[PDB]
């Protein structure tokens, strides 16, 4: 009937990690009240605007299903207003930095006093107690700190950031797990908890497979499925071989599978003119026979050299170079359809152009057209979890302070006090 | 005490996505029974082993805090055992494929009749109803399907996979949100729901920022924070210009800032010899005077060609190049401390080796030594969410079928009735 219907979210967040978390809670039915500073608001509003004096797409795509109040919290009457809101809130969400909320007059300890049931949820750069606990962290800094950058890209290039928001939105989603887990605890104890997610830790969690590989490397001195282990395939700077001699930390493997199933990024017709004309092709062991049939190589079916993972690992790049010749006169989707005949794990690199206007993603509610009568409609990503008993209803992002008076009435305030709060500039 | 204490989890999952999800639920207190194929078990047991005939680090790092039973579900005595288990379960989790669970006898409709409170959770490649409902996907295929590969890497190279498990673990973390949301809903209705996460959708959620960029590109013709917005900076492999005059889909921007402020990956002292001797360095808008002091360009403070984001668009990559010049004699951590004095957001690329031995990560419970007397101790990633009122207790991954008898005895079955199942090869 809507999972978070009746959950009151007092939302101090700004930028991406925090706002991503509360938006998604909003999509699941929560009543999200965004507290914004008087005059300015969330810095995403003015960030890379596509039209002057209109809230940016950075703002709108992270702040749907929210209401906005302006509030000067450096003010005695504003701190009092927060106290009432805190008494009515189920969860407060924040990303102010290492000691900022306490400095504002709101200790965890004081918060428990005001409401024994409220949950305090925070995003930080580094975990509390960490030596770098006070370092400031944006998106790519967190990718660097959590091991992703070191292990992404190519052996002869730099550490490389992912286009995906491994640091920001990923942290927000991990924080949503934490908040929902604290809600389940509260059903037993009747009490709220403090939950926090550090961006470094959210990234490390997705980089679990590389910590696996670091241990494998420490124990054996080799990762036989990595490109560096193939006979003279990779080269340093001066034209000579690379190898796991002298490699002590997980290296970049380009477009290697990253797991138990070898893969590579294979060019398709149009690659010279189109940056996204590629397919990813995975050799799943249980269907090497089917692969042999597609690429017309019956000799490889019965040959220990090309028919087991172990036989295969010393010449992966020759096998991928050869499969790739088969795709030179076929586009992405033709290659994909061809492979779907055999149930092969092969699919296209989808461009952002293709995804934004894909009819399937819109049918299933993953890409959603938001009706925004103030700014014009925009696309967004909806809820990536689909439920049998409920569908989200996505609603446009709030103007700065649009809901101030409406929210103040909900607390229980008169037209007298509201009009004087506007004169005193606390709202 | 622990959030998911009392939650019985019936876990059919193999590989990474489902197993990450159920492991994390286990870290949070859940009673996770992993149901495995007789004789074989989860294929991760045998993938990338570091010691022959010992469950790989792949399996153990995704299957802590679980128990294992072997069950042949294709037999009628197996299906009967399942029925008793479903009646006892709070959530079932599966990644079998589109029609697979229904063909095994257990439709959502029958599952509801057996247990009206059970939640059915599934990971899929593509969402139900998608034209590609039927395609087979693993990690890097999902990355390609969801936009990450197209927007990760460099403009003169291929689509690039991320080292982070954007497809698998990310999907599992998203499914955890869905399961936890279904549990909060069930407190109100007394009823279980079906939840499903598609890997494409979990990837796309993290690439939300690039859907912002795609609409900005369509609306305005330019992405001013991207390297390609600097004249005569970016060129393809043939030496052709790359400008937003001709780009209609969000391009790869190398090490550009993403949802952060403008930044780049800059070389430090070790770089020709140490793949990970770099920092990520951000030029935040409000921090220009500080950067000018740091790099000793006082002349750049009051110059309009340098002192606004808009003025730097035509030269941003030249500025990074000049900043990098000041790091040639300094390592990663020195550069980081130096930048930190100025409040500049800047951190090192942490290698997996550095991450595996970092004392802070072990102290905060993020990198954890699991006690495994059978296989020898190993490291794993712990819970990335930290709570005020509880600490996870991570225990070693199960051997195949280690807990079969134990589990059957909790179901009710007495000793001689269990012996008949071992002989008939149901278990």
Swiss-Prot record, chains A, B:
Keywords, A to Z, come to: Cytoplasm, Transferase
Query: Could you tell me what this protein does?
Result: Involved in the catabolism of oxalate and in the adapatation to low pH via the induction of the oxalate-dependent acid tolerance response (ATR). Essential enzyme for the bacterium survival, as it relies on oxalic acid as its sole source of energy. Catalyzes the transfer of the CoA moiety from formyl-CoA to oxalate. It can also use succinate as acceptor.
GO MF, one term, reads:
formyl-CoA transferase activity
Q: Please list the residues that bind substrate.
A: 259-261
**Gene name per UniProt:** frc
GO CC annotations on file: cytoplasm
Q: Which NCBIfam families match?
A: oxalate_frc, PRK05398.1
Q: Where in the cell is it found?
A: Cytoplasm
Record protein name field:
Formyl-CoA:oxalate CoA-transferase
- Activity at various pH: Optimum pH is between 6.5 and 7.5.
How is activity regulated here? Inhibited by the sulfhydryl reagents N-ethylmaleimide and p-chloromercuribenzoate, and by chloride. Competitively inhibited by acetyl-CoA.
Q: What is its main location?
A: cytoplasm
Classification via HAMAP family: Formyl_CoA_transfer
């Amino acid at each position: 009937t809507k999972p978070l219907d009746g959950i009151n979210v007092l939302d101090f967040t700004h930028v991406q990690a925090g706002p991503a978390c509360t938006q998604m809670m909003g999509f699941l039915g929560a009543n999200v009240i965004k507290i914004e500073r008087r005059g300015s608001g969330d810095m995403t509003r003015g960030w890379l605007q596509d039209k002057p004096n209109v809230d940016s797409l950075y703002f709108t795509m992270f702040n749907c299903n929210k209401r906005s109040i302006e509030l000067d919290m450096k003010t005695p009457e504003g701190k009092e207003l927060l106290e009432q809101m805190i008494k009515k809130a189920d969860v407060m969400v924040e990303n102010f930095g290492p000691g900022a909320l306490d400095r504002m007059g709101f200790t965890w300890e004081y918060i428990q006093e005001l409401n024994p049931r409220v949950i305090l949820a925070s995003v930080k750069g580094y975990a509390e107690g960490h030596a770098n606990e006070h370092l400031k962290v944006y998106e790519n800094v967190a990718q660097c700190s959590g091991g992703a950058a070191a292990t992404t890209g190519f052996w002869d290039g730099p550490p490389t950031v992912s286009g995906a928001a491994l640091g920001d939105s990923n942290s927000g989603m991990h924080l949503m797990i934490g908040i929902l887990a604290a809600l389940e605890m509260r059903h037993k104890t009747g009490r709220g908890q403090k939950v926090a997610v550090a961006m470094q830790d959210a990234v490390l969690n997705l980089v679990r497979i590389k910590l696996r590989d670091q241990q494998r490397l420490e124990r054996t001195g080799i990762l036989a499925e990595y490109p560096q282990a193939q006979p003279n395939f990779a080269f340093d700077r001066d034209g000579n071989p690379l190898s796991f001699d002298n490699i002590t930390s997980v290296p970049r493997g380009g477009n290697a599978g990253g797991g138990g199933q070898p893969g590579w990024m294979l060019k398709c017709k149009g690659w010279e003119t189109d940056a996204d004309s590629y397919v990813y092709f995975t050799i799943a062991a249980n269907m090497w026979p089917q692969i042999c049939d597609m690429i017309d190589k019956p000799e490889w079916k019965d040959d220990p050299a090309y028919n087991t993972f172990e036989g295969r690992v010393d010449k992966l790049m020759d096998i991928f170079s050869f499969i790739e010749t088969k795709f030179a006169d076929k586009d992405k989707f033709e290659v994909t359809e061809w492979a779907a005949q055999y149930g092969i794990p092969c699919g296209p690199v989808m461009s952002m152009k293709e995804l934004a206007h894909d009819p399937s993603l819109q049918k299933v509610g993953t890409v959603v057209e938001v009706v925004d009568e103030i700014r014009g409609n925009h696309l967004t990503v909806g809820a990536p979890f689909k439920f049998s008993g409920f569908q989200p209803e996505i609603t446009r992002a709030p103007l700065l302070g649009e809901h101030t008076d409406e929210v103040l009435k909900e607390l229980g305030l008169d037209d007298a006090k509201i009009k004087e709060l506007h004169a005193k500039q606390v709202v």
